[PDB]
C-alpha cells in the first residue's frame, strides 16, 4: 500500500498563481455577512450586512449603485437567480424576502420559519428555494405560490448552510452537529450522511464543474464526491480554525477564509495549500476585527470578493506575472500519520 | 404498597418534568435511569437509556453506565448485542473498546477478543491500541500468531521504532533464524521502502546498530564488515579505525572563522602525523 505512497510523490500537483489585494471598498456600517454576484453579466455584487441593509456595488469601478432596505435585523444570506430577475434575501428576523430587480422592491415574503434563517439556496432548474436556520430543518418553497411544499427533517442542530444540485441529492446541508447530509427530496429522506467532521460544519461550497462538494470545520477542510457520497480528497491544514467560508474557482482554486484573518488558498484536485495571506485589518480597528465572514469568485474566476468583519469589502486579484520566476508555493510535503 | 406506589409515581412525575424541559443535561438521565434500576425493573430503565441515546449518542459516560446496569444483573446477550451497536456507532473511541475487551477477559473467552482485535486492528487505530494486542498474546502464546501480528503491525506504522520491538521480541521466541530472516528483509524491504519514499524516516544510526549487534550475538567478524561497507555505501595491530574514527570526527567538528579552522588544522594534522597524504 505504501508502495503507492512511494508513487504518490509522482503527482506533483498543478501549479497555480499567487493572489494579491487589488482594492478595498469601505461603506458598510456593520459587518459584511454575505456576498452574491450577478450570475450572468458579472456587472455588480450584492452585500448582506449587520446593519440590516444591502448595497449593490458596481464591480468594475467599485462605486456604489443603490442601497436596499427592508430587513429589521441582520441579513445573513443572499442569492441572485440565474434564470430570474429576482434577489432572495434572508435575515435573522425569521423572514425570507424576494426582491424583484426590475423595480427594486419587495415582492414575496415566505413565511413559516420558527427562528432565524441563515441560509438560502436556489434550486437550479425547478423554481424552488431552499432555506434553513436554527430551526434544524430545511424548507423547500414553491417560488410562485410561496408554499412550504417539502420539509426535510434531519439534523439535530442548527443548519449552517444549504446547497442545491440538479440531479440526486438535490439538497446538501451542513449543520452544527458535524454532519453533512445528502437529501432525497421526492422521498423526503436522507440519501447519505457524511459524519467525518469533528465539530460543527460552518462552510460548504460546490465545485462549478466536477460535481462534488467541499466542506469545512475547525482544522479540517474535506471534499466529497456527490452521487455515491465518498470522501474523495483531504486538504492539508495546520490549525487554521475557524473556517468561515469556502469558495471554489473554475480553475480548481479553493479559497478558505478564516476567523484569524488568514486567507488560505488551496488546489482543489490535490488538497495542497499553495499560499497563505493575512489581511491588513484597518486604520482604527481591533485585532479581533480582522477576519473573513464570506467570499465569492466572480464568473470569470480571476477576482475574489470577501467581506470582512472590519466593515470592508476587499477584492483580491490574481497576479499576472506569476509563472515560476518566483511563484513557488508552500512546496508539497506529504507528511504522514 | 401505596407507601411504595405513590412514591414511584411521584418520582416519575418530577424526573420526566425536568427532562421534558431539558432534553440535554445527561446528568439527569443517568440519575433517573438509575432510579428505575433500583426498583428492580429493567424494562423501564432500558427505555430511559435508549431514550437518552437519541439526545446525544456521543456521550460516553452514558454509554458506559448502560453497560454497567446490564452487567451488574448479568444480562449477557443484551450487554453483548449492545456492544454490536456500541462500537459500530463510535468506532474510533478508546474507552469503548477496552471496556468491551476487559469485560471479555473476565468471561474467559479468548476466541472473542481474538476476533475483536482482528477488527480493531483492521481499523488501524494507533499506538496504544496495537500494544494491547501484541501484549495480549503474551498472556496467551500464539508464537506463530504473534509474528504475523507484527507482520501487519509494521504495515500500519511503517516506521523504525516499531521494527525495534519486532527485533526485540523475536529473539525472546528463542529462534535465531526467524529473527535473522527479516534483517536481510530489512536490507531488501526498508531500502526499497525508504529509497523510493522521499522521505519517510527509516535509515538512522539506530537501524545500522540493529544489524551490528545482531552479528555480535553470532560472533561474526565478516558479517559486521559487510554492514559498515553496506551502510557507509548509502550514508549521506587492530587500532587502524581508532585513528580513522578520530580523524573523521576531528575534521567533522565544524569550524566557523579563521582561528577556529586553524585550531582544527592543528588537531587533524597531529592525527595524520601520528597515524592521500598529499591531498591532506
Amino acid at each position: 500500500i505504501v508502495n503507492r505512497y512511494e508513487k504518490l510523490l509522482s503527482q506533483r500537483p498543478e501549479w497555480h498563481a499567487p493572489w494579491k489585494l487589488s482594492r478595498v471598498i469601505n461603506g458598510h456600517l456593520g459587518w459584511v455577512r454575505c456576498v452574491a454576484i450577478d450570475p450572468v453579466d458579472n456587472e455588480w455584487f450584492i452585500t448582506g450586512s449587520n446593519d440590516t441593509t444591502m448595497k449593490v456595488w458596481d464591480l468594475a469601478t467599485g462605486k456604489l449603485k443603490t442601497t436596499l432596505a427592508g430587513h429589521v435585523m441582520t441579513v445573513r444570506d443572499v442569492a441572485v437567480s440565474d434564470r430570474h430577475p429576482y434577489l432572495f434575501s434572508v435575515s435573522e428576523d425569521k423572514t425570507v424576502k424576494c426582491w424583484d430587480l426590475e423595480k427594486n422592491q419587495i415582492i414575496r415574503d415566505y413565511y413559516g420559519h420558527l427562528s432565524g434563517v441563515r441560509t438560502v439556496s436556489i434550486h437550479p432548474t425547478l423554481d424552488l428555494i431552499a432555506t434553513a436556520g436554527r430551526d434544524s430543518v430545511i424548507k423547500l418553497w414553491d417560488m410562485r405560490t410561496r408554499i412550504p411544499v417539502i420539509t426535510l427533517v434531519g439534523h439535530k442542530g442548527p443548519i449552517n448552510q444549504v446547497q442545491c444540485t440538479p440531479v440526486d441529492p438535490q439538497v446538501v446541508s451542513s449543520s452544527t452537529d458535524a454532519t453533512v447530509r445528502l437529501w432525497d427530496v421526492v422521498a423526503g429522506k436522507t440519501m447519505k450522511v457524511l459524519t467525518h467532521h469533528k465539530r460543527s460544519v460552518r462552510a460548504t461550497a460546490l465545485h462549478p464543474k466536477e460535481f462534488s462538494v467541499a466542506s469545512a470545520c475547525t482544522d479540517d477542510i474535506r471534499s466529497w464526491g456527490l452521487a455515491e457520497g465518498s470522501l474523495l480528497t483531504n486538504f492539508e491544514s495546520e490549525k487554521t480554525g475557524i473556517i468561515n467560508t469556502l469558495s471554489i474557482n473554475q480553475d480548481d482554486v479553493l479559497f478558505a477564509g478564516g476567523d484569524n484573518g488568514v486567507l488560505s488558498f488551496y488546489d482543489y484536485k490535490s488538497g495542497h495549500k499553495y499560499q497563505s495571506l493575512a489581511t491588513r485589518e484597518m486604520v482604527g480597528s481591533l485585532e479581533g476585527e480582522r477576519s473573513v465572514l464570506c467570499s465569492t469568485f466572480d464568473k470569470t474566476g480571476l477576482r475574489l470578493i470577501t467581506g470582512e468583519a472590519d466593515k470592508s469589502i476587499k477584492i483580491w486579484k490574481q497576479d499576472e506575472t506569476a509563472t515560476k520566476e518566483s511563484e513557488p508555493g508552500l512546496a508539497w510535503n506529504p507528511n504522514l500519520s | 404498597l401505596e407507601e411504595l406506589r405513590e412514591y414511584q409515581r411521584r418520582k416519575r412525575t418530577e424526573y420526566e418534568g425536568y427532562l421534558k424541559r431539558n432534553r440535554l443535561d445527561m446528568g439527569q438521565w443517568i440519575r433517573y435511569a438509575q432510579f428505575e434500576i433500583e426498583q428492580h425493573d429493567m424494562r423501564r430503565a432500558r427505555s430511559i437509556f435508549e431514550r437518552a441515546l437519541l439526545v446525544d449518542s456521543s456521550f460516553i459516560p452514558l454509554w458506559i453506565r448502560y453497560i454497567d446496569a446490564e452487567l451488574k444483573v448479568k444480562c449477557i446477550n443484551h450487554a453483548r448485542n449492545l456492544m454490536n451497536r456500541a462500537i459500530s456507532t463510535l468506532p474510533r473511541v478508546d474507552k469503548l473498546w477496552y471496556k468491551y475487551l476487559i469485560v471479555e477477559e473476565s468471561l474467559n473467552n479468548v476466541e472473542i477478543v481474538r476476533s475483536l482485535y482482528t477488527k480493531w486492528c483492521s481499523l488501524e487505530p494507533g499506538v496504544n491500541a496495537w500494544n494491547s494486542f501484541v501484549d495480549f498474546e503474551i498472556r496467551q502464546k500464539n508464537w506463530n500468531g504473534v509474528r504475523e501480528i507484527y507482520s501487519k503491525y509494521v504495515m500500519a506504522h511503517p516506521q523504525m521504532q516499531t521494527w525495534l520491538k519486532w527485533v526485540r521480541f523475536e529473539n525472546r521466541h528463542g529462534n535465531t533464524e526467524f529473527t535473522r530472516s527479516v534483517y536481510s528483509l530489512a536490507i531488501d524491504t526498508v531500502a526499497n521502502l525508504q529509497n523510493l519514499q522521499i522521505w519517510s524516516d527509516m535509515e538512522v544510526a539506530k537501524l545500522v546498530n540493529s544489524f551490528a549487534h545482531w552479528e555480535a550475538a553470532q560472533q561474526e567478524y565478516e558479517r559486521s564488515s559487510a554492514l559498515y561497507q553496506i551502510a557507509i555505501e548509502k550514508w549521506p595491530x587492530x587500532x587502524x579505525x581508532x585513528x580513522x574514527x578520530x580523524x573523521x570526527x576531528x575534521x567533522x567538528x565544524x569550524x566557523x572563522x579563521x582561528x577556529x579552522x586553524x585550531x582544527x588544522x592543528x588537531x587533524x594534522x597531529x592525527x595524520x602525523x601520528x597515524x592521500x597524504x598529499x591531498x591532506x
Binding site: 490535490s270 488538497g271 | 468506532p91 481499523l123
Partner: peptide
Amino acid sequence: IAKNVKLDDFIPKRQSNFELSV
C-alpha cells in the same frame, strides 16, 4: 460491529491519484 463499518470508508479516494474523474 462487523457489517456496520469498513476500513476503506475512512480512507479518501483521490489521495492516491489527482486525476480521478468526477
